[PDB]
Amino acid sequence: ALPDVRDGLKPVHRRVLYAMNVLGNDWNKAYKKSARVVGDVIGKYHPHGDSAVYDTIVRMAQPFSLRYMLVDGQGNFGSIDGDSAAAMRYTEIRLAKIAHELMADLEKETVDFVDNYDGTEKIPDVMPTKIPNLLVNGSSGIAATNIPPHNLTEVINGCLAYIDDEDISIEGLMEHIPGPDFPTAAIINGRRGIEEAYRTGRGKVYIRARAEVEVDAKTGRETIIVHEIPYQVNKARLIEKIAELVKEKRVEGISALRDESDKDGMRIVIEVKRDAVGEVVLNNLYSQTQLQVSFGINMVALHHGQPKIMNLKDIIAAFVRHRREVVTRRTIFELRKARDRAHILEALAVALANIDPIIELIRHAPTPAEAKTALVANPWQLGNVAAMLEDDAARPEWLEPEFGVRDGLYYLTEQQAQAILDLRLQKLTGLEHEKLLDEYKELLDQIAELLRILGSADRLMEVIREELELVREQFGDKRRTEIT
Amino acid sequence: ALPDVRDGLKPVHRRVLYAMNVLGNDWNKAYKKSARVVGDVIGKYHPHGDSAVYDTIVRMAQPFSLRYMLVDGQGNFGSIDGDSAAAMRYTEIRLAKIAHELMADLEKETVDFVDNYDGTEKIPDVMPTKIPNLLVNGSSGIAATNIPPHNLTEVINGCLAYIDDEDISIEGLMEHIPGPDFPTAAIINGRRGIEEAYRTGRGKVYIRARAEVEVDAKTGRETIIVHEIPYQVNKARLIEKIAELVKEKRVEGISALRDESDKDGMRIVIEVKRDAVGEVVLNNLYSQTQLQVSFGINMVALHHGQPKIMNLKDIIAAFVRHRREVVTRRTIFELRKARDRAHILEALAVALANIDPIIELIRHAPTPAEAKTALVANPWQLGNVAAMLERDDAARPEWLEPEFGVRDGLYYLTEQQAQAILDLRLQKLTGLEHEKLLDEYKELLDQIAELLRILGSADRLMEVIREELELVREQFGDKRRTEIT
């Protein structure tokens, strides 16, 4: 599958993250065993093999795999030497903080949902992401796409620059986004390959290990130290290949080879023979090993449901258009939700102002259906809530004109009558009664504010911008990969 | 793992069935995709490989594997030829009706629960089963136990005969349970091996295919037809072994071999050469192939947490003792639950009889806490529910202190009763809803009296147990399949 251009996710990734969200497997709550999330995914969303689901989770937790990890893992999640993760019953996971930004406002009718595999559950078609995840975490797929990861600060600055100037050039965007940024650091060589990829969607660059020749001050002997290796290279396999080249005499001048890497960092030590030149040995290692690799940037993603080759500007534009859709839908949802709640609260307020006749009516009703019928049959006096209740701004858009406040009287709907019948006796106490009235007044202010936002293109675009700025403050970090 | 003697299950089976129960994957509801159950099991109860969990589900659904299937499956669940089941996202399952009897009263504090693997969930240690599942479905394990399956009517009869007479002999039990009964029918040969296994826990019997020699009336040519094969034999493997023996000339006289089995039944056809004798060919096949197999009965199960070799009476006695424990626990639970509910209903009835002062009190309380305080501070007149409430003390919860409840024509509420009043919805004031609460109270008083009779009498307890076993026999008992010779 190709990633969606808007959230950077393939279905399997989206299913995992959604399952974690539904479970409440939050960044600020206790870790859960990986098996619990796997079992949920398998059962409800991705019924295709515990090991493939668990592999997805593992990869999302590994700091050498994802530039911004989506899963916060505790335990053994494998290594850059290709060691396996521990079994899913042993490792523990929760959502990374940044994953919550990928899923912000999911409950606010911001994205379309589709059926799961058996038609018993709903799954988001795309996440309502505040993070430009496709660019920052990248994607690959060989069945094809190959998008490298990027620095979040840089990409947010590029998004804001596009919002400021929709005609910005690729050169203009590259002042903010000079190239990829790998979790594994190292060096990118080929500035024109970057530019070609950003302009056209395709370009080839080379990634090189950070390695130096050291000279021992007392003896003059040379040692090559490798500090950082290219993205997606397996360190153990790299060291084995070097040993094989030394054995076959395809690379000369190496007296010893040792991995001294540990928890604190990578350190591959290659000692140079006294009669060899360190720089020459190192150059031969770059030409014959994965100390240098090519990376064919191929920026293909799903856009309006179809596979598309996309340039840097196309990708940014799609993300920003997604934010516009999300924020507009979210604000419409909040307005609807507030109007619906205010509508119920009007009924409860009117009922509580008429508590004596309401009780009398209900007590003498043979059944709840007959009580509901009696509640809606005649309108109610407003009493001391007249001023509070008497703009049509708070009325739900679906409410017919025969209902609500009309000439000093309240005409209830059957659903309002049901809300009255559902009122608990404890709502008659002073504090509970007052809380309902206060909530109504707050909702009126919230409705007015939401209408001001929906009425103003400037307000809406500002909400989009400010959300991007906040992401940069909360999650932006330093560049790791040097571009040459 | 060894199965528990009481429910016949190993942990993995118990975790699967419990997950289905918790999901509401009931016999009378829509089928669910197998993957849904597998995912629940992996997540909460058995975090060890989707294929192993699914393999357990699948076996529990196969009519050639289980004498009484515990899972009702729809879709391809494999075959007697060893075909694999379809993938878990394309098969559908729910609990078999009889599985609900295995788990009857699980929600009634009838069995101990233990922690799952991560300490976040509880799992029953054993099922509160109304079915003697160890005997009827059997068990095997090689890491050792080997218990064949048995006919449920027969086994229930044996249980009832033990209840009637605790000193019944093995011979007495065998009048009801003459031997094993395989899902796959066929024939058992070795009556003394059965008796040895029932008396001691161990004995060897032989299982033989049902096969006949047919003669063609017009031509005289003979054909062997195999109708039924021994339990746990793979039909395809059997046919291959026969072909190999014919090829190597270790069995002579066979001109053709064909599997003509289909949906309607098994039919393996072995044509006999004109110059060979059918009966002689068939006897040679019984001596060299799985048309006949041994079955080493080895009745080992977990009893009071330890492995032990158990004879037929030991197993029956353990099942009946389990029923006594389950029914006693269930009755205690139901009594507590009914008293707790009756206690809440008294409060609601008294409040509804005092609706005007109750409303005045609440309206003038600043908060729900202060309303609760006011409700409990002083007692309430009983009004028209005096007769209903006063009438024993039989309905009082055992934990209720004497300062509470009905006292000298007045009702003294607890804080929890007051909370129940404050939680009442306005719709409960209607005539119908009010009447339903009063009717429920009166039903509870009758239920309480009946539960007290059970707890007060060992005879009444055993009568409950006996009647439950009789009902299982009536609902699920079926005909014997395997012929004993």
Residue numbers in the entry:
A (entry chain C): 33 to 175, 179 to 425, 429 to 522
B (entry chain A): 33 to 175, 179 to 426, 429 to 522
How does the study describe this entry?
DNA gyrase consists of two subunits, GyrA and GyrB (97 kDa and 90 kDa, respectively, in Escherichia coli), forming an A2B2 complex in the active enzyme. The N-terminal domain of GyrB is the site of ATP hydrolysis, while DNA cleavage and strand passage occur at the interface between the C-terminal domain of GyrB and the N-terminal domain of GyrA. A new GyrA NTD fragment was constructed with a view of obtaining a crystal structure of SD8 bound to GyrA in an alternative conformation that would be representative of the situation at lower ligand concentrations. This smaller 55-kDa NTD fragment of GyrA (GyrA55), comprising residues 30–522 of the 875-amino-acid wild-type sequence (compared with residues 2–522 for GyrA59), crucially lacks residues spanning Leu17 to Asp23 that have been identified as providing 10 of the 12 protein–protein hydrogen bonds responsible for stabilizing the tetramer at the dimer–dimer interface in the crystal structure of the GyrA59–SD8 complex.
Comparisons within this structure reveal some conformational flexibility, with overall RMSD values up to 1.28 Å for monomer–monomer superpositions and up to 1.37 Å for dimer–dimer superpositions. Superposition of each homodimer with a homodimer generated from the apoGyrA59 crystal structure (which has a single monomer in the ASU) gives RMSD values of 0.87 and 1.20 Å, indicating that there is less variation across these two structures than within the apoGyrA55 structure. The structures presented in this work fit with the group of type II topoisomerase structures that have a closed exit gate and no DNA bound; that is, they are consistent with the existing structures.
